[PDB]
Nucleic acid binder design. Sequence first.
RNA 1: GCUUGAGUCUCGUAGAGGGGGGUAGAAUUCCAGGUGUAGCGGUGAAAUGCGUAGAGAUCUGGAGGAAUACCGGUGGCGAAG
RNA 2: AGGACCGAACCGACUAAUGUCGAAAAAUUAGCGGAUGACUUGUGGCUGGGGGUGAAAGGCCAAUCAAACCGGGAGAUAGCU
RNA 3: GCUCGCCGGAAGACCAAGGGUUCCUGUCCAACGUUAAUCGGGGCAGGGUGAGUCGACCCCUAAGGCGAGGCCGAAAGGCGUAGUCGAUGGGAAACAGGUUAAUAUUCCUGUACUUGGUGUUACUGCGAAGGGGGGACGGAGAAGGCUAUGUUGGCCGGGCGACGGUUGUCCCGGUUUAAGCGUGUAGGCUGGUUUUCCAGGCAAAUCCGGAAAAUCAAGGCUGAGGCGUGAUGACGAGGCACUACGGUGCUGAAGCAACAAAUGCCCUGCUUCCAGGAAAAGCCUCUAAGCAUCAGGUAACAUCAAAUCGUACCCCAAACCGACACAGGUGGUCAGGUAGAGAAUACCAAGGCGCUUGAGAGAACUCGGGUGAAGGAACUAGGCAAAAUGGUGCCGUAACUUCGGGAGAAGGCACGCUGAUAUGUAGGUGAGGUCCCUCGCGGAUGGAGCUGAAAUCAGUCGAAGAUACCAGCUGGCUGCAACUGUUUAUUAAAAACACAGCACUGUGCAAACACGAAAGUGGACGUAUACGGUGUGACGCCUGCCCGGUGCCGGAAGGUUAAU
RNA 4: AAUUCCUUGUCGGGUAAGUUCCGACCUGCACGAAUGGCGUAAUGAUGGCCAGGCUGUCUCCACCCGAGACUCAGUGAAAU
RNA 5: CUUUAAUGUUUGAUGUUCUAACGUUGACCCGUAAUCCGGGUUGCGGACAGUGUCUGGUGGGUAGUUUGACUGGGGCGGUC
RNA 6: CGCGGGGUGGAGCAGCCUGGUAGCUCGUCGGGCUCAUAACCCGAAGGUCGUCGGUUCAAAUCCGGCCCCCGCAACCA
Lengths: 271, 46
Amino acid sequence: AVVKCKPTSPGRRHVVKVVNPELHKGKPFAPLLEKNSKSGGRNNNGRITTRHIGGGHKQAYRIVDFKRNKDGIPAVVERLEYDPNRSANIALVLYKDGERRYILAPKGLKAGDQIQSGVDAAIKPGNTLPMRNIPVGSTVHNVEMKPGKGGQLARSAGTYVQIVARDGAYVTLRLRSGEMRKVEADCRATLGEVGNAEHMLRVLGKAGAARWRGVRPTVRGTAMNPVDHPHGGGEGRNFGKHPVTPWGVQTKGKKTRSNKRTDKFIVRRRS
Amino acid sequence: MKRTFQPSVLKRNRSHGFRARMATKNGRQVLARRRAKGRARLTVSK
RNA sequence: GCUUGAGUCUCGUAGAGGGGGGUAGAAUUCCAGGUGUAGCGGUGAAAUGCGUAGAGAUCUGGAGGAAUACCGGUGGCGAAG
RNA sequence: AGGACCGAACCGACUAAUGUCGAAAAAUUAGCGGAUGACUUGUGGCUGGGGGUGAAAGGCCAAUCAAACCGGGAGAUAGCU
RNA sequence: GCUCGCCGGAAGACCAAGGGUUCCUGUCCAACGUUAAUCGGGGCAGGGUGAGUCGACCCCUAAGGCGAGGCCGAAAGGCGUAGUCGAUGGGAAACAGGUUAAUAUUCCUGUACUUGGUGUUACUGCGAAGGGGGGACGGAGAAGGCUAUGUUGGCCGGGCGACGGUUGUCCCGGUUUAAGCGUGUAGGCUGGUUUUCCAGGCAAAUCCGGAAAAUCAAGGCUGAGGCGUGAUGACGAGGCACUACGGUGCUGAAGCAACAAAUGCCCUGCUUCCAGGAAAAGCCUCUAAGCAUCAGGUAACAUCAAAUCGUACCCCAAACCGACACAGGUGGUCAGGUAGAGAAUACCAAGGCGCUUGAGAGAACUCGGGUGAAGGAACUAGGCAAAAUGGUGCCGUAACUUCGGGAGAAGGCACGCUGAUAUGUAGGUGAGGUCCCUCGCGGAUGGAGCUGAAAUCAGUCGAAGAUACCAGCUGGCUGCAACUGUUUAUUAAAAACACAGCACUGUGCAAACACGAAAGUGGACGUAUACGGUGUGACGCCUGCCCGGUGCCGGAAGGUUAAU
RNA sequence: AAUUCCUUGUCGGGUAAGUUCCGACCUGCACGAAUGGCGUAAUGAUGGCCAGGCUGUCUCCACCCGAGACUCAGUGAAAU
RNA sequence: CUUUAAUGUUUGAUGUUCUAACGUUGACCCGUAAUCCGGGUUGCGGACAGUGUCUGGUGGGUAGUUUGACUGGGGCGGUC
RNA sequence: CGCGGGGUGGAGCAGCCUGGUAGCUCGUCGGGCUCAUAACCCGAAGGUCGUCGGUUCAAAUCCGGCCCCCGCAACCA
C-alpha cells in the first residue's frame, strides 16, 4: 500500500512509502543468510571502477534458490519476508518433505498458498516449469538461458515476460525492454507476474533516502575542471562539447553493443 | 593544530618493519642499500 | 381501525442497465520473405511526400492497438449522463 | 516519527580585536553554525605520481601540488645575471 | 606552619596509546631551567616493577594481506583456491582489608572460583576436518522495577563554646562492608510431555525440520536487586601511650531507619518504524569410517600443574605529537553538596595548584574592561563594534501558505520573604496491625511516619523581587538558492557543489562501462520498476520555431577506396 | 534586472535632500524557455534597503580599573 | 568482332545443414572437506565467436611539439 | 584614429567579381473588368549608377580624395 506522508519538516513533505501489512515484521530464516560486506566500487587493485557507490546501510544477503530443482513436491508459502537486496520480495516456502527455501514473490500470491516445481505443475501463478509445457502468450518471469543457471530475466519488481511463439526448439520472448530473443525452450520460467509492484511509485524524498541505500553524490562534468572531465572549465557554465563520458566515449547517442556471440539468438531489438 | 605524526608502533612496524621490507623484491633492495652505506640501524625495530 | 394511496412477499417476462475477467473475425499499420515493374499517392489542377537502395499492386506468415459491418427500427434500457 | 526546534559535551570555523621577529609556521578572548544525523571520533587495513582521491576547489595526496618525496641520468641546458 | 587566592564534568582520580626510568632515597650545583637556586623530570651512586583469576601470547574469525598447486604475464611480477595470518570482535576463572621511601584485584591475612593431566571407585557405548542448536546482534522511544549515591532522623563519641544569646526544635565528626555459595523475587520469553512416520539436512542419525494423532494444562529457560551466609571478622571517630619530633605501637563505641534517585544494571529485553540491522570458534547435541573383556565418556573424590612476557611514572601533560619545560591537539571511565531542567553556569567537596623572573611608578600611547550629563546613526563603504532583548507559567498573535507552518510572531502580565487554607494540601512513598492462602522475597485491607509541588488571599520591605552568573533584538520590501547538508586545512563558507525529483540515451548478462598488457574482479553474488553517463535541479503553471553547419543513429544502390 | 553601453534613463513612493532600494514605462548597446523560463511557504553564521528599541559608533571626549610602556636589580635576542 | 548456349574446368561470393577444431563465466562426477583450476561424460552454440600479423577509417582518451619579426612600450592595423 | 562593405528609377534589392548591353518586384500613368472600389488582366514610361578627378578605345564597374551610412575595433598596467 502506498502512503504519502505529511510535511512536519522540510524534506519529509515529498516522501511516499510503500507499506506492506503482509510482510513479516519479525526476523528472516536463519540457515539462509550470509555476509555481503560492501565493496564501494573497488576491485582487486583497490581502484574505484564504478562511480557513485559505497557507504550507506549494512545489509545481510538472503541466499534464494532460483533453480527450482526440487521437482514435483508441493510447497506451502509460510511468510513473506522483506528483501533489502532485491526490488521484489522473498517468500519463506516449505515443501511437503520438510525443507524450507526462499523464492521470489509473484503477484497474486498470499500466505498459505500451494506451489510446485516441474512439468507436472498445473497452470497457477507461482509455479516453475520448462517453457515447452507452457501455453503461448503466457506471462512468466525468472526465465533462464541455460538448463541450470537459475534464472536471469525478469527478476525485479512488477516485471513480466510475454512468450510470443514456440517455433520448434526455440521460444520467442518479448522482454521487458521490448527486445525479442530466442532461447533454449527447456529453460524453466515461473508463472504469473512478480509482486511488489508498487516499488516504482516510491519517491525517496530526502538526500539521505538515497544515501543510506548506497549511492554517492553524482558530480556533473560541467562543474569540474577540463583536466578531470572531458567537459568543464569556462567562466559561467560554458559548454559546446558533444556529451561524452568521463573517459571520452560518446553518450546520449552511440550503440555500444558489440558481442556477436549472442547476436545470433536476438531477433528484434529495442527501437 | 593536529600534528602530522600520531605514532603507533603496531602500525609503524607493519609498514616499515624488517619483514615488511624483506617481503618483496623492491624492499630487498633497501636492506641491500642500507647495508651498503654501513648504516647501523638497518630499519626501524628494537 | 378500514381500504381504493404507498410498500413487501409467492411466479414469470423483455432489455446495448452496471462492473470484472476471457475470446473471435473482418479491416488498417508495420514487419519478414517471394513474384514483379515504373510509376504511386493526390486534388478542381498541382505540389510536398513515396520510388530502380526496388513502392504501389499481389501472395504467405507473424507481431500489435482500437473499434465492433449486416442484424439496427421516431427499437429496447437508464434518474441523467 | 522527524536530514524537526532551543541548547551543553563533540564537530566545525562567520565577525571583530589581539597577534604579524606571535604563547602558536592560522592560535587566543568575546560572540557564532550543526548538535538523532548526508552525525561524530577511536582502532585497523585498501587506493599512488599523469596515478590516486575528490558533495568539484584544479582543492587533497606527511607544514610542499596546474602533476608529491628520495636517489640516479646530471657538472641537464642557458643567445641570461 | 598559619592566613589568603584559583580549578573543581577540572587545572581532580585512574586505564589505553606513545615515550623509555622521567618513579623513590642520599648527594652535588659547572652546564640545563628564559633570574637566583641549599630546588627540581639536571649530573652522580644506590634502590624500585613480584600474578593460575588483569592484559599480551593462546582458541576463533571480519575488512584485508600473504598464498602449495594453478591461471596469467618480456623478466620482475599480477590474481587467486585449499589453506594461513590478521582485533578495535567472541571465548574459563578474585573480592575485601592491611603494608613500602616507591609496586600491588600480583605481597601478607581471611575467604572462594576456573580449566586440564593423572589415579581409584561406581556406572556407561564412545567416536570426526561431517550435520543441528547456540553464540547472534538495528535505530529510536516509553514505562516499571532497583542499585550506585546523597539528604535527613535516630544512635554513639566529643563539645557547651577568646564581642552579645547558646543543656537546646543545639553544634561538630562517624554511622562503611565485597566476590562466591544458598534463595530465584520484580519481571522476560516459549504451550509442554508421549508414540509413530519421513523423496530434507552431498552418507548416516535417537539431534533438527515437517505431517499425523495421544495427554495435561503447566512445565521449562532466563533474570538486576533484596535477604541470610561471607562477618561473635575487618575497618572504624576518637583516646591511652612513645617521638630519631617523619610517624609508630596499642586499644577502640555506634555501625541502623527513611525518603529522593541516576545516563549504571534489568535491557544479549518490550513496543514501534524502516534504510531490515558481522562471522567463526568455545559450548551443547547426533552419527559415519570404525573401535567394543578395550579405548574413552558421566558424577564424586585424592593429588599435581596453570608456563613466558607486560606491570615503576606521565596519560587533557615541564615526560605523548608540536625544533622549546610551547596559552595548541590527545580515545575511554569515575564524576559529590547547594541553587538549577542540566554534564551550562556561581560558589564549594575529596584532591590538586598559585601557572619559574620580581620590586617600584602610576607619563603619553597600546591592549583587556567599568561608567557616562545632552542628543541618538548626525558615524561610516556598511548600525562593524558595543549597547540592549534574554527565564518559567498564562493571555494574545497578522499578511501569506505546499494547510505542517508562519510564531518563541508581535505585544503584555504574574514572580521576592512570612503567615494562612493545611501545628506543610493535592500527590507520591509506605512500616506496624488484621485476615486469607496452591505458605512465600505472596496477596487485599490498613494507614502512622517520611517527603513534597502549584494555587488563592493577607501582611511586609527596598529604587529594583527571572535581583548574580546564565540567558532571543523585533518587524517590513526585495534579489539569488527549494530546504538539511558540503566546499578552497593555511586570506573566498557564497548566489558555488550537492540534493530527492524530471528527461534523453547507452545495456538482454561472458550486460554496457571501468581498473588491469593478461588472468581476474568490480557492475552484482544485481538482472530493464535494473545498471552506467550527461543535462537540469523541490513543488506549481509551462517547456514555442529551425536538421542549415557539427555530432550521432538508420539505409545501403552507385561513385571513391587499403591490404591481398 | 547578478543582464541597460549611452545612464544618476523617465514617472511615482519613501528623506528636508536618495548615483542605492521599491513599483512601473519598453528606447532589451547585448533576456528567454532544461548551458531551463516565470513565480514560490519554510530555510539562510547570504546580498541590497527602510522603520522602531538601544547605545561613546559619532557630535566631543572625560574619568576610573587592571596588563605593558617608565625606573631599579638579574638574565639576555632579532631583521639591518 | 558483338550478342549468347550446353559441358568440362578454374577459383570466388551467398545460403542451409552436419561434427570433429574451438567456445561453454550450462548440469553432474572425480582429483578434494576447495563456489579457483584441470580432466571425463553430456547438453547448447559452431567453423562463427575470439585471438595473432597486415590494412583503411574514427580518434585531445593520451603524448612530443609549433604558434615570426620589425614595432617611437606590447596588442591591434600595416609591412617584409 | 583604424579594418571590411555599401550608396543604382518613387522604394527595396541584382548586375561590379572577370570593364563596351542597366534587370527584377512594388510603386506611377493610361486602358479594361463591376453600378463603384479593391483585386486581377493588358500596355508604356521612368535610373546624373552619391560627387569630382584620373587611367582608358570603352567606366556603374578599376584607383584615389571627400560626404553620407552600416558593422567592427577603440586594448593590458
